[PDB]
Amino acid sequence: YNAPSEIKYIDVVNTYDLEEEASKVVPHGGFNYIAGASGDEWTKRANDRAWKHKLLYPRLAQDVEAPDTSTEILGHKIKAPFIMAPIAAHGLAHATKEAGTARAVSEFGTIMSISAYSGATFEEISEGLNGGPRWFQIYMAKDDQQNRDILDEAKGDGATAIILTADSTVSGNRDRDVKNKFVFPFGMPIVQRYLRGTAEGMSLNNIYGASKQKISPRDIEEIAAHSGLPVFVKGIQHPEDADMAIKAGASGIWVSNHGARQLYEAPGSFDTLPAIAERVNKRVPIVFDSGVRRGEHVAKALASGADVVALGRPVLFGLALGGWQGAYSVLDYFQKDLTRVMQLTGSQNVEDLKGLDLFDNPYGYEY
Amino acid sequence: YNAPSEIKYIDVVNTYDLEEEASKVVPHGGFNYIAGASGDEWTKRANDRAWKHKLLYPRLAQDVEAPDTSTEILGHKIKAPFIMAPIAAHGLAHATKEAGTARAVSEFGTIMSISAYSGATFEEISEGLNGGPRWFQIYMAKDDQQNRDILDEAKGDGATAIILTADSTVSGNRDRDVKNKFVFPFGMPIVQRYLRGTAEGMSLNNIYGASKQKISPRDIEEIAAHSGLPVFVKGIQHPEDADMAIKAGASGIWVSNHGARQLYEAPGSFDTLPAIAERVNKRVPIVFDSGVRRGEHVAKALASGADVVALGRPVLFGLALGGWQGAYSVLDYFQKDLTRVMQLTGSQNVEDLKGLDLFDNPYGYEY
Amino acid sequence: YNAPSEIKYIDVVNTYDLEEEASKVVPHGGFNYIAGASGDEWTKRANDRAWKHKLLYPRLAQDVEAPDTSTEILGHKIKAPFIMAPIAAHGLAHATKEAGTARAVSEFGTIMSISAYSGATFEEISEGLNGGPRWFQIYMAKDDQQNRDILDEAKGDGATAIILTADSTVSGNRDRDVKNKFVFPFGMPIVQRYLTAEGMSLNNIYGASKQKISPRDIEEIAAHSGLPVFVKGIQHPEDADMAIKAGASGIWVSNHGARQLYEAPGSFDTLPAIAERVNKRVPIVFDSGVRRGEHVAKALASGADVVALGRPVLFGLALGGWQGAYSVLDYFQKDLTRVMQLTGSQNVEDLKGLDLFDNPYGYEY
Amino acid sequence: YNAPSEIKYIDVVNTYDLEEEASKVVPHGGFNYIAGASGDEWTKRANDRAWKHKLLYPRLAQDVEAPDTSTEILGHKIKAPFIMAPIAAHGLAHATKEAGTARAVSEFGTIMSISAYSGATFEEISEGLNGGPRWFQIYMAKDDQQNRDILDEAKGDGATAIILTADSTVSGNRDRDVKNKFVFPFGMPIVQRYLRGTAEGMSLNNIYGASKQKISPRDIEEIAAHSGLPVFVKGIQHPEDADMAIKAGASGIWVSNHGARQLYEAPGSFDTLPAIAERVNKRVPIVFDSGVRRGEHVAKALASGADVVALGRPVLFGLALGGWQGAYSVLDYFQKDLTRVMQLTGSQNVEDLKGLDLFDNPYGYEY
Ligand SMILES: Cc1cc2nc3c(=O)[nH]c(=O)nc-3n(C[C@H](O)[C@H](O)[C@H](O)COP(=O)(O)O)c2cc1C
Ligand SMILES: Cc1cc2nc3c(=O)[nH]c(=O)nc-3n(C[C@H](O)[C@H](O)[C@H](O)COP(=O)(O)O)c2cc1C
């Protein structure tokens, strides 16, 4: 598998351009595993276009200067209101894999979420983190002792939160991967204990098939009880699931449609956030993902009831283009992009973003 | 007329790509008679885009595993909540014609709808069905006695329901077939008695022209009284017609716009379904059709008041690609497609689909 | 300028296709005069896309057979609920000019509307019409004598109604015509008295015509002529009130095929508010974008009594003289007949009562 | 830097065509500095498409002839209800630069707004104006004394209003300029004092960066007191900013989004105008800009609460193609374009425009 290996900073004009730039250096199967989505990708497009539904106001004479992007979540002080989403198999994008990403996230000054489907070991990722905060994202085994073992290993590594991803009990209908007969070109060491052999050579379909299908609210209770860490439930698009998760002992709600990689013909993730936030009613923090590309998207999420957002495909494409420094350039971009938005919207700090008026655009994308 | 004749299973990634595939092995005229619709096909596009007006939510920690697609309608146990739509002249798609389709439907474990405009005889279809359940779809004669005879032969053959299609008293404005000067290359044995001759060489316009124009609610009561079978009324897009039909003695409502092949500049069929379901108020079963291409569509139709859906074009395209095995592959695709959708929506059985919350998408297709 | 000249029937599958086909037989400048509209033609597209705002229902077991398309308007019995709209300089389309259209309209069995900016004389047109009804559409001279004379000539020739066109006091911003330096290649007998048209822009022609039309003008035309008067060009309900009050016997809802005010609604979208104001006081003619039987149906379900046909008939004339134009009318009649059968309508009155499905998603659905 | 120099009238069919025409005579970097906007320019498109949201009615038999376009604002009599927007660096478009634009505006008979980021000195512009009225647009220095001098200097030149442009406290995300590495090829003599060096070679990001970031309502107060002139606050899109501005001593409101060059993923300017006009409630005059390309636009804006509009890009494109004569030709087109719209909408004068009904188009651009 010919993953790129060059390490270098990159100029980011916008993150959209990074997709096509990455397509030229990443192998065809892996690239399309990363970039693609369910069906004909209408819900991926909806994730993007949802940002035009609520528009930002420039505000004038607001007595603002040098906006501050720092915030805090569950007692982590972070440099900007975003974190790194859990993403499988970073080796598809760059030879330095999750250790590359981890170094970038750490030196930038935010939180790394570690996928259970990582192609790096905890030891390898930890080398990249170099002390930096990490949250571990579990894809559950069917066997209870194996979940206890995985969670114990995650906690031993330093995780300060557990992310239960529950929107992938079976795979999405990912046409590109089907058409490409995509299989993983390397192992997944954290979960291989419950796979039939090694992830190498398996389809995602069958790896999710090995994970737990019959997730119930008791799993949230049990993960909380066992780990003693705050538990996020990830993949929420319906507000009743945020109330269920909280009542089952969740410490955070992670609004997401898995980057449109899961259920097809579903809403753009952003359009779901306000009802979710209204139901959460500030009981616990909210992480939002699925389609964040610009500082304006960071701002709009917060104004709509998120505390932080999670970043995904653009960081991975930066990773492809420049290893840890390319991924860092993308994080840096987002920080600067937000800073501009903060200044022009009249926002001095992060809490101010959460209070912004939004202009309703009933005409949608074509205006 | 060089119809395809190969029999084989086929890979279905999505049903949409089956159209272009079928186009390369079906003669130009018949292919376009199958794919085409009225006018510039805006209402066919509407049938497809309607599915984006109501969007599915993924649901989490639902305690669902191995969902069951099995259901029952008018006492028939079927393997999934879909049945075969009545479609004329399957020999246009495949040399094995309706006998091929029958075998696929029967082997799969659902209901075959026999079109009065079949190019195959009752016994030739019965061959392929091998004992499997069948519903007969009447295009009425003007002559009362010819209707009684057609119903008698249908019932004698084993029909357990009669379907009256009443949205075709004259033909739609099918631009492709006008431009191609399409005429049928074979005969229609069941309705031949009222054609003045044979369907071979006749336009569809003139075949519809020979059937009954002055259909009335008495026709429904007469068919129910004579056959002694439950009667569906097919073609309904307005709720008042549902009230009419039930009052006239129908045992089922079949919501359909005939694949957009009849009235032009009409709504997408799915958009008309909630109003008709509300009016029906569970008094009889509802079959929905016109635009079903995905398991998501099956789920949405049920969530919106349908009890089952009927499949059309994609099963025909499958028949063209690999005979009965080809059509079978299509049925199997829909079954697996729906199973995924059930798992991700939190539906353990088919009844749970009927209670799903849908997200309203007032932006429509471009979002 | 050489207009086509061939006469023949045509196979009309839809009217949209006739635009491109005609483009291949009409000289460029003239064809684009016929086909073009103001600005980037956004409002002409709006006229066409408005039809998807209200959708028809198929209706079943309606006990209907052999629908009847015939109707009546201000005493004239017609074979279908449409008439020919007034259009200028038909010789741009076909050598046989307004006489060819006349004959088509006449044999088909509906009413012809005569433009004052016609290229043919009353007499040339009357031979075409062969005993058939006609409405004269006036563009007003700034001088009263000339209006009296035109009106008498028009009633002398046989006009049974008068159409006041009031939406063209100055021209639309027609970019095609400006880019093409388009000028009329021949003359308009009926109005040259206030100008020859040959070699002048439409801007300067409208320039000569009356800019300060007022409600008085409608009273006067009714008075002088003693014939039922239509006010043509209306898109706002208040002008329907203004009109009826000044003695109009009919409202003609229209935006001039989008050849006039730009960035305005599609014409069909304006129709309900106007019909509601009119409150069946006088008959309503509707135009600006009818292309299908479905459109005739929707306009009638929406408060119109008949529609007027424009572009497609003229494309039909380009292609095949009188016989082509006739094929288009025959198309519309048979197209309407299908829609009636599928919608559950036995007759034209049934069309005016159809329920329509509201589509708030618009054209892309 | 190869600015065009030809001086000639031009036959404007529509303003949109001027952009491509100008692109062939203006140097690449400059041209794209002028034409471009923030991000993917979605908000520049929204500026343009907002015009289709409210549609004009033709009105008949209105007894109207020879519409009068002239109007009055803050005691200037002007020939049509539009003025010239303050735009930096006309030298990017034409060697005659701001003196050329000035002559056109002066001869047409309206007001010139002078950008603090002019490439021409007050004297050069004054020569072109030849006694014509002028408003000066300030980009604030951070140093108080220096603002006093700038305003003293503008007042001495004959400014009869000051325009505070407050939506540019930092630059928009102008991807064209980033990608072209645009820097100014000449100086800005008026603001040299606070760049402490030439603008030549500097980016717009660093120029804005030198102007004042922390603009507060007190700045508006201090400018109105020190200058004794009516102050406009420019860049307003939210109704609260209009309240704030009038409260702080402003004598006019200027609704603008900087032609989409500033905050991205914001509304189209016109959609913001009614709510601002309702809040202002005729207390001061309103100038509207950002996307006016047609006479129909000027009408719609006045019908929506504007007193006059400000014209930007189309005028500069004219200047590129014809120096002062080409710019003049643009002003002349607008005036005739408006005149046609007055006649057909039944508007005898400018006040009549302000009373026009508009048709609400909820279907937006695609209809
Ligand atoms: C290539 C890829 C791999 C992913 N793998 C995982 C995973 O292992 N675990 C998980 O919880 N989410 C995973 N996600 C979803 C991300 O956590 C996140 O929801 C998504 O990337 C947000 O969408 P965006 O990148 O389009 O903005 C993955 C997403 C991508 C694109
Ligand atoms: C090629 C073709 C032939 C059809 N023939 C019949 C028929 O003979 N009888 C009938 O009731 N409906 C007929 N229909 C309508 C089908 O019952 C069904 O309503 C339609 O196929 C649903 O649209 P879809 O197939 O695009 O989903 C036909 C449809 C197609 C495409």
Ligand SMILES: Cc1cc2nc3c(=O)[nH]c(=O)nc-3n(C[C@H](O)[C@H](O)[C@H](O)COP(=O)(O)O)c2cc1C
């Ligand atoms: C080429 C052309 C010339 C026209 N000339 C006139 C005219 O002289 N007087 C008039 O009242 N309307 C005129 N109209 C407007 C028509 O009466 C009618 O309102 C228009 O054709 C409706 O649009 P449609 O043909 O696109 O359906 C003209 C239209 C066209 C296309």
Ligand SMILES: Cc1cc2nc3c(=O)[nH]c(=O)nc-3n(C[C@H](O)[C@H](O)[C@H](O)COP(=O)(O)O)c2cc1C
């Ligand atoms: C090249 C260019 C330079 C501009 N420079 C300035 C400026 O120096 N000061 C300012 O207040 N506005 C400036 N603007 C904004 C204009 O004042 C005005 O808001 C804008 O041109 C209106 O948008 P439109 O030209 O697309 O109609 C500029 C706009 C452009 C395109």
